[PDB]
Design a protein around this ligand. Structure first.
Ligand code: HEC
Ligand code: HEC
Ligand code: HEC
Ligand code: HEC
Ligand code: HEC
Ligand code: HEC
Ligand code: HEC
Ligand code: HEC
Ligand code: K
Lengths: 503, 56, 502, 504, 56, 57
């Protein structure tokens, strides 16, 4: 029994918690994980796009084949020797890593804060014996190149042109079953009460599926642009985005910088908001006083950590830490998504608010934490109200057929996309007056500036929902929307007067 | 099923009235008319919300 | 007497320097501090706004009352023990703080670079003894939960539902009289020769007053938005924005990051400009080489600091370091404020420039420092001239009544604001065509882009006044203003031709 | 011979690399370096602009005169003593620098990772012996105030009012001949096959020349705004922009922050792109684990560095490291420059691609690196395409004379600029409707947003070519250009109908 | 000096490398009538070839 | 009482004329007319500013 995995996961897998072996649990998780119906492969719009060269690393299970050269047949030791100058830093980083130094983990003492790693090593060994990859009286010697890139605990020679693979989530999960299962449990825990988002979303478990099931991503001709989106959406496929290859350091993944590359930018500025907040500035100032090697559960005591971080806040749930990051989500970044605001006062959201309060009250008083979280909720709605007034104007114009070029120069989006108003497609594709300026402006008002307003509120950066992001930029959009609206009415009336003189 | 849509301004007014009498008057969190923040009678907003919860 | 407090403060409090005691100085300081006439309370527009839940921590003296639960009578030790479960990290942060380890400060030897702290502790004890909170020969044992949150050096029980307070500036000032007085002296030193800004402003001493005396802040319905402004404007009320609770580390407050949450953004990008300069990039590269625990006066020697920081530059005055950050202010961020540009040549501004030159010449030559500060002044005015030309266009339209929607769709701002052209209110409130787009653009040209241009110049970030902030963005605003003006002129002429056809 | 200096440098200076002494190499370099025909001085538009107060520090060889006060003569120790009070931190920083502790370098043992410095000191001494500034038995005692600021290894007194100089590239180069020669070699290696950019550009060797040869810089009246451009363009003149005065730390110059003040902003956001990429975030996370004091060549072994940095990528060429940063340059930031895109498939660009691939294989496989660089090239062209379609619209309007205010309110730019469409000048000068909004918008589309798109691609920040920079902002520009184009079309259509109603 | 070749034409040329003149590839940049434009490799190669002949 | 308003361009011309003779002719820092930077005589700007300094006492 992996006690950190929810009942819903075992139930969805048709497994008994107590009876299931590591082999059985792994096999069931992988069966779902690799099923096209459950999100794997090219997805529903696969006939519209082809992989590019980098795609073999982004989705290895669908696209990866080993290189035609070098034509080599190598032992475990040969991988290291040859790559020591072929890809030198990979060898050096690996040699530095825990994966290459398992004996040091066995020698750990019970009074070491890092002792938990010895228990985890034995857990991995227990998993592997169950899978038949390790002998009952055989210790795992190391986790080397050939283990991840060919087969776990391989004893013989590998063909470089035939046997080499890119380690995917299921590869890591062969040993790290707990973490793989916890991550996969996002499919089962992230279920919205009214289907505000698709079941299991948003999550890391289905980030790549979300990406390839986005219409413009599949429809747009600019493949190299689309694949930038893919690079932020690979957690589904590979486990090296927070703790990177080839050091695979847990301490690294605990640092706020590990999340920054993806959780940043114009429609979700989490890195920007967090680091500018007091929380994040303290994290910058105190990073050398904190013991990052300590597990998240020990961070606030044995680690000396006195300010919250992405991982500590988002991986915490009801006093425990898992690779499941979905269970406290209420707003889900984009406050305008139908049903989200309306759901904010439900028992479901309230229970998730309670769970957040527990996170905050490790430091703040409950009265303090609830006071600010109330400000966050109401400030988000206040932003939403502002956008809704502006959208009422522009959406009316669309339905009235009065947007610039709407009947004159609005070519259809690329297949299989269908035409519409203020659609996600119009951010990554445009032609003629599709979209119109007003249309893009009100779209970005919600997509970018309202989203960033909420992020600013959620991550405690005053400027990030007032002057600089959120209210400031939304104020301008509102002003310019109203201005263009009035100008276009005035011009429409002037056109009507010229029509009269002609009639 | 799916939730009946409620505007953010209505969600706000409902929240402001969530612990008081139907006869009580509160200020809007969003609306300005005639150089003044719009006042909302709590009975009117709760009634508009409760019919929408029924349609959900 | 407090050596680092200016004469004008003692005069303003009706005190004699060579006679006044710590107790007398504190009480006079606080008497002004808590006086509504001097900025305390809800302010002149308090009938237009009400506190929200967080407001009790933002302005505790006006709004705070302890929680109805738990119903607990507690001693000093009980605070620590129960909150070890309730707010565990507050206890751990406090336990590792100087406040909880005063005997370590007493044990400091004269060859320890932190030795100055021992003398600061003794000054604290002197203050308390003068006030009758500490015995003449009684050592201050600790500064614990009960001290800040109930009463300094309390020996008996406290009622959680009645005696708990949020510690305000005057609470800290009970012990840290020097720093609180230094801070409060901003009221007396920041006086403009022609009333360019209100007396005592801008400053940390009156940051909260300035916030609540802003019309749109009081007038707007979006309280949670307005309260974001409040969060950057709390220094007047509480002393934990640079050296945070519950560690209260001076080293922390010395780091540029401590100022960043507030001193950043579209209308004052100091953090952005500073960090991007050589000065700030060096501070980032060298932060591990410097001893931040060393006091500012010793930063460049004992600390090993070789690049300037916010605190080192702004707390420095004529060779001394204090909590007063106002004495060298000349431009005050917004170069368009009436009387500011005209005042840049005055003996008042030149004296403050001399003080800045002294700051720079700890490292640079005077010739170099004055070369750059001349560039800063002239570059700022060049930005201002660009805005002024653009403003002449939009202001003429306003006077003509020709702004889009000016006569047909221009509703009045929320009370008690009065309608007008390009006013601060239009950045936080909009409805219909109030403001017009042209009106907002030219307002933002000055409020945001001219201000950032100056900040870029003041803090030595070349891209911050040329390509990226300042000149580049102001150029776009200028271009787009001229374009819309010409477009609206020819459309007006076209409407005139249709007019004479009817 | 200087082993790290390219053949083309010796050929350009007519030197035999097997024969030329340090003195001869230095003198030939400096002769070119100080020649107005090669870029020195006020440049071709010198009659149009005058220096401001700070310019004496920005271009010392042209503008610097010593201060009139103090009116004193001073020996070596008097520099240190008086400035210890007058500019205290400068003396303090100098004291902890290698320059002031040369004996520490002499005592470096062969098991010290910094041992390479002992060889560098000995080379510096050999250079000075060749130049007659040091005896054959004489060791270099120090590099002090008098040495850089008056004359290398000066034995007597200096007149503060006459003899004081600001140390320029040739000053540093007296001792550091290798680094100076490597830097100057950019003149000779950065030659574009079809003159896409002027010969030797872009480079640090000619950053000041490029600055003062920019028309708007010389033409605009806002000198203090123009000198902000200058502050980013001083490498040609002084050697303290990466390793700053007065510590002159090699470790500091190896850190990504060293390049950030100049290599950032609206038209080349390299610092922003790099730091947000995984590469940069890892550099932020791992900086304390690395030994920045080791040379770039030892960075990945002795240094422990596992993520790439500005210096390690851009100073690297075929397994070696030099102050020449030009030899792998293909795109040169601005993808719209005529001939740059067309050149991306040439053998010249392909050879520089192989060089980049090598750089990446320090860590990644060749196949991985080639996969991403292919993405970079094609993503860049996709952005260029988007801009080009937008430009066709606004350029047509210019040809037609239909831009807002084109015939009624389009005053000429300040001398010696010539009027034109979408010219660099319009970013730093505007009056009336010069430029028009549409004209500026499409200009910034290429100049800022297309350039940042490429930077994002080149430096592996996914958001920097998609949502946040590059594609997103270019999409908005394209949309707004199309929208205004359509609005103006139907406005002129309406005006034409009014013209008909006036025919009566 | 290189004769001007547009970015879209450059992309199509890149896409057509190691392929037959009769082979058809997708555009990297162009959408017409709701679909990514298709380009014959023979056409793009030819257009590029008449530009390399006019280049110095 | 307030200072009399002086435009930034006039402030710049005034500063450009410090340690210069009244007959000295300097370039504007802000103005371009007819494809050239406007020239300002130092005596004229000094007189303009003096009038403003006397307007506010
Ligand atoms: C030298 C004789 C080698 C030995 C022994 C091994 N590998 Fe290798 N590897 C070698 C080269 C020259 C390359 C570059 C191929 C290219 O075109 O980039 C590689 C590549 C890899 C890769 C990456 C493959 C990819 O798709 O990018 C991996 C994951 C890899 N090599 C692993 C690996 C393992 C596990 C080995 C031992 C069993 C091994 N290599 C042996 C050269 C040599
Ligand atoms: C448990 C037996 C407690 C003892 C003994 C003390 N406190 Fe306490 N405190 C306790 C709880 C459960 C809470 C949370 C109340 C809430 O609704 O959030 C608190 C709160 C505080 C606060 C913050 C109050 C606020 O408005 O946010 C402070 C400043 C505080 N407590 C201080 C404090 C002091 C000084 C005590 C000793 C005299 C003390 N507490 C005792 C529980 C318990
Ligand atoms: C005191 C008696 C001094 C002695 C001996 C030396 N210098 Fe000096 N120097 C001194 C002052 C007060 C200043 C400031 C001048 C100003 O107006 O800023 C300087 C300046 C310099 C500079 C910078 C000059 C500039 O143009 O900014 C340099 C480079 C310098 N001094 C170097 C220097 C050297 C090498 C000396 C020994 C030969 C020396 N100084 C002596 C005061 C005194
Ligand atoms: C940034 C772009 C730089 C400029 C401009 C100059 N230098 Fe530099 N320098 C830079 C780096 C990244 C390094 C480390 C290189 C390495 O291989 O490790 C250096 C190093 C030097 C050194 C050697 C010092 C040492 O390693 O002990 C010298 C002597 C040196 N640099 C001198 C020098 C001169 C004379 C310059 C002007 C032409 C110059 N540098 C410019 C970065 C940069
Ligand atoms: C400001 C003083 C700079 C510092 C510090 C660094 N760089 Fe730079 N660099 C600067 C300019 C103004 C230019 C262009 C010069 C011109 O021709 O106008 C450059 C050029 C480069 C290039 C080549 C650019 C191209 O080919 O398009 C590279 C690769 C480069 N610089 C790298 C670089 C690095 C790694 C630096 C830190 C160590 C660095 N530069 C410092 C301005 C300045
Ligand atoms: C850029 C885009 C993009 C390029 C085109 C594509 C196709 C995606 C896909 C999505 C989808 C879909 C969502 C909605 C979530 C869902 O399941 O349906 C969007 C979310 C998103 C997140 C989560 C934001 C939150 O909820 O807090 C993050 C972190 C994103 C980051 C990447 C990004 C890295 C800088 C890039 C580039 C894009 N996305 Fe995305 N994505 N994404 N994305
Ligand atoms: C947001 C705004 C705002 C929201 C509405 C409110 C009410 C204020 C009020 C002010 C006022 C007033 C000033 C001018 C100074 C004065 O005394 O009259 C303005 C200044 C300001 C500074 C100083 C800038 C300088 O001079 O260098 C800073 C640092 C500000 C910080 C906050 C900010 C934190 C990110 C947010 C939110 C706002 N302000 Fe303010 N404030 N402020 N402010
Ligand atoms: C601001 C501008 C500017 C102000 C006006 C002036 C005159 C320049 C001049 C140039 C020129 C010219 C170029 C093109 C290169 C060349 O040789 O002709 C431009 C390049 C530039 C780079 C290189 C970009 C790349 O290729 O990667 C860098 C890093 C520049 C940065 C500075 C800058 C610091 C923040 C400021 C301000 C300007 N430049 Fe520049 N410059 N520059 N520049
Ligand atoms: K550190």
């Amino acid at each position: 029994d992996i006690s950190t995995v929810p009942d819903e996961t075992y139930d969805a897998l048709k497994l008994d918690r107590g009876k299931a072996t590591p082999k059985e649990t792994y096999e069931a998780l992988v069966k779902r994980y690799k099923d096209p119906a459950h999100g794997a492969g090219k997805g529903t719009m696969g006939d519209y796009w082809e992989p590019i060269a980098i795609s073999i690393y982004m989705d290895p299970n669908t696209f990866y084949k080993p290189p035609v050269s070098p034509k080599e047949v190598a032992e475990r030791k040969d991988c290291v020797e040859c790559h020591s100058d072929e890809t030198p830093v990979w060898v050096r980083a690996w040699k530095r890593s825990t994966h290459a130094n398992l004996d040091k983990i066995r020698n750990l003492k019970s009074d070491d804060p890092l002792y938990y790693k010895k228990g985890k090593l034995e857990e991995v060994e227990n998993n592997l014996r169950s899978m038949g990859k390790l002998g009952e009286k055989e210790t795992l010697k190391e986790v080397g190149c050939i283990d991840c890139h060919v087969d776990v605990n391989k004893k013989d020679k590998a063909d470089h042109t035939k046997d080499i693979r890119m380690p995917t989530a299921d590869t890591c999960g062969t040993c790290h079953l707990r973490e793989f299962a916890e991550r996969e449990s996002e499919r089962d825990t992230m279920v919205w009460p009214n289907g505000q988002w698709p079941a299991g979303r948003p999550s890391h478990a289905l980030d790549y599926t979300a990406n390839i099931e986005t219409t413009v991503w599949a429809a747009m001709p600019q493949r190299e642009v689309a694949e930038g989106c893919t690079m932020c959406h690979t957690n589904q496929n590979k486990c090296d985005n927070c703790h990177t290859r080839h050091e695979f350091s847990a301490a690294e993944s605990r640092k706020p910088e590990a999340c920054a590359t993806c959780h940043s930018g114009v429609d979700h500025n989490n890195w920007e908001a967090y680091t500018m907040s007091k929380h994040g500035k303290l994290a910058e100032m105190n990073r050398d006083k904190w013991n990052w090697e300590v597990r998240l559960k020990d961070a606030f005591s044995k680690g000396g950590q006195n300010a919250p971080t992405c991982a500590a806040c988002h991986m915490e749930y009801e006093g425990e830490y898992t690779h499941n990051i979905t269970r406290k989500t209420r707003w889900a970044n984009y406050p305008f998504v139908p049903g989200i605001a309306e759901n904010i006062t439900s028992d479901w959201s309230e229970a998730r608010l309670d769970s957040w309060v527990l996170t905050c009250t490790q430091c703040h008083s409950e009265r303090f934490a609830r006071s600010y979280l109330d400000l966050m909720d109401k400030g988000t709605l206040e932003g939403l109200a502002k956008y809704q007034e502006a959208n009422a104007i522009v959406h009316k114009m669309y339905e009235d057929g009065t947007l610039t070029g709407q009947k004159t120069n609005r070519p259809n989006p690329p297949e299989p996309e269908k035409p519409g108003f203020g659609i996600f497609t119009q951010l990554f594709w445009s032609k003629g007056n599709n979209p119109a300026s007003l249309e893009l402006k009100v779209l970005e008002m919600a997509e970018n500036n309202l989203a960033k307003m909420h992020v600013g509120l959620a991550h405690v950066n005053p400027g990030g929902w007032t002057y600089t992001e959120g209210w400031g930029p939304m104020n301008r959009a509102y002003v310019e929307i109203q201005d263009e609206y009035t100008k276009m009415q005035e011009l429409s009336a002037l056109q009507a007067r010229v029509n009269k003189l002609e009639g | 099923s799916s939730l009946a849509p409620i505007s953010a301004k209505d969600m706000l007014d409902y929240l402001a009235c969530k612990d008081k009498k139907p006869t009580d008057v509160v200020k809007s969190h969003t609306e300005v008319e005639n150089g003044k923040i719009v006042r909302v009678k709590c009975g009117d907003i709760v009634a508009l919300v409760q019919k929408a919860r029924e349609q959900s």
